């Protein structure tokens, strides 16, 4: 198998996701005891967000960079961003380092692709949901539109995000708000939800979306095993 | 802060707790969003348990020094290796890689000489509560004394570690077993008991040990916290 690296800890509970899911998706296929070749490299997710928060994008750019060639030092044969807004400074990762970048977006387009669905509502951080970044990829190359919060939902969310979910509080008042979110998304033709900040996950359960569920950060994960034994790659 | 690096996928099951306890660690000595700067090589756990099952422990000595020298070379300041029965070959690692090694039996020994104990119990791998590489470190720098079980439950302990809790399976049948095995060395003058092996918590609340326990992942994470913040 190739060897996965992980650029993790945007927030760490979401990256603990993404190696569950890697070593289930390699035991799965592999059996007995095989487990995934992961290397991670989990950032403090401070230093990451407070530069969100400043639009100093072009210094995150270079601390993930700088990670994944550190990574290819240690071996990994291709790189995973666990973090939907991360992917805004995807370009300083796959300029800097050789290794095959598999993009978060790709991912969960080929995904709504087989949904048959080409209208769909994205949930996610407010820099996710609001930049041209994720959703124009998703239009460019799969012809996807998203639809997304009012701005007053999108300025909750996001608070949820950043002061519950990135600090592992689940409450059942957030649960609810992101619950009823998507069921006003749904009343406007929304045909599937993006669950496209790799935490929304943990807090929303599949049964509380009356849409059906894209889940990023799973979705990406399976697209790494893939990647680690040659299939569907 | 210091990177750690863990070396990890001993299995995954017992990865994730050492990934969760220094992150958590972390935020609550730095504050806010703070996160653990980590870097972690796993394996896959099929080439190592094969090894341990042929004695082939020289090769599982390359795996794991060439791994911590790849850390070392990613940024790396210090290695943790997640797996009690690993320690066998650590001195494998030591002398490939000049990180400071985190040792998960001193860090066990600082325990159980904290709450004044010379005679405890000890389950884990048939290997690791059998041999003396463990248990002879120790004796050797704390003066502490490991009891274990009789033959056919270390053959039992360590069939539900292989064949169950490495798989993620957590049955209350093995719950029960390993708890009666604590009662039973705890009718033998056991003071505590080690979790020496790093997936035993994940399948034996404290509140089901008749004695106190160490779990020897969480006490190695906070040991590694302690390192990456030049603490303890
Ligand atoms: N978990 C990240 C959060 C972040 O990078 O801000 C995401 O999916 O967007
Ligand atoms: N988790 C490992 C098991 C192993 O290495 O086989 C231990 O603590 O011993």
Same mark, same amino acid.
């Given at each position: 198998?190739? +060897?996965?690296?992980?650029?993790? !800890?945007?927030?760490?509970?979401?990256?603990?996701?993404?190696?569950?899911?890697?070593?289930?998706?390699?035991?799965?296929?592999?059996? !007995?005891?095989?487990?995934?070749?992961?290397?991670?490299?989990?950032? =403090?997710?401070? /230093? *990451? /967000?407070?530069?969100?928060?400043?639009? #100093?994008?072009?210094?995150?750019? =270079? *601390?993930?960079? #700088?990670?994944?060639?550190?990574?290819?030092?240690?071996?990994?044969?291709?790189?995973?961003?666990?973090?939907?807004?991360?992917?805004?400074?995807?370009?300083?990762? /796959?300029?800097?380092?050789?290794?095959?970048?598999?993009?978060?977006? =790709?991912?969960? !387009?080929?995904?709504? +692709?087989?949904?048959?669905? +080409?209208?769909?509502?994205?949930? !996610?951080?407010?820099?996710?949901?609001?930049?041209?970044?994720?959703?124009?990829?998703?239009? #460019?190359?799969?012809?996807?539109?998203?639809?997304?919060? /009012?701005? =007053?939902?999108?300025?909750?969310?996001?608070?949820?995000?950043?002061?519950?979910?990135?600090?592992?509080?689940?409450?059942?008042?957030?649960?609810?708000?992101?619950?009823?979110?998507?069921?006003?998304?749904?009343?406007?033709?929304?045909?599937?939800?993006?669950?496209?900040?790799? #935490?929304?996950?943990?807090?929303?359960?599949?049964?509380?979306?009356?849409?059906?569920?894209?889940? +990023?950060?799973?979705?990406?994960?399976?697209?790494?095993?893939?990647?680690?034994?040659?299939?569907?790659?």
């Amino acid at each position: 198998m190739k +060897t996965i690296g992980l650029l993790g !800890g945007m927030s760490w509970e979401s990256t603990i996701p993404y190696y569950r899911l890697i070593n289930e998706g390699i035991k799965q296929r592999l059996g !007995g005891l095989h487990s995934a070749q992961v290397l991670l490299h989990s950032v =403090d997710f401070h /230093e *990451i /967000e407070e530069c969100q928060r400043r639009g #100093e994008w072009d210094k995150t750019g =270079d *601390i993930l960079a #700088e990670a994944a060639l550190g990574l290819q030092r240690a071996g990994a044969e291709g790189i995973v961003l666990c973090t939907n807004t991360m992917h805004k400074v995807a370009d300083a990762i /796959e300029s800097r380092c050789t290794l095959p970048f598999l993009h978060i977006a =790709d991912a969960t !387009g080929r995904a709504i +692709t087989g949904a048959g669905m +080409t209208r769909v509502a994205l949930l !996610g951080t407010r820099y996710t949901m609001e930049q041209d970044f994720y959703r124009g990829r998703l239009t #460019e190359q799969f012809s996807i539109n998203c639809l997304i919060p /009012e701005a =007053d939902e999108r300025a909750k969310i996001n608070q949820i995000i950043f002061e519950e979910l990135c600090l592992g509080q689940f409450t059942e008042a957030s649960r609810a708000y992101y619950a009823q979110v998507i069921a006003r998304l749904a009343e406007q033709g929304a045909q599937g939800v993006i669950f496209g900040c790799t #935490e929304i996950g943990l807090l929303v359960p599949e049964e509380r979306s009356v849409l059906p569920v894209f889940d +990023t950060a799973a979705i990406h994960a399976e697209d790494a095993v893939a990647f680690m034994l040659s299939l569907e790659h």
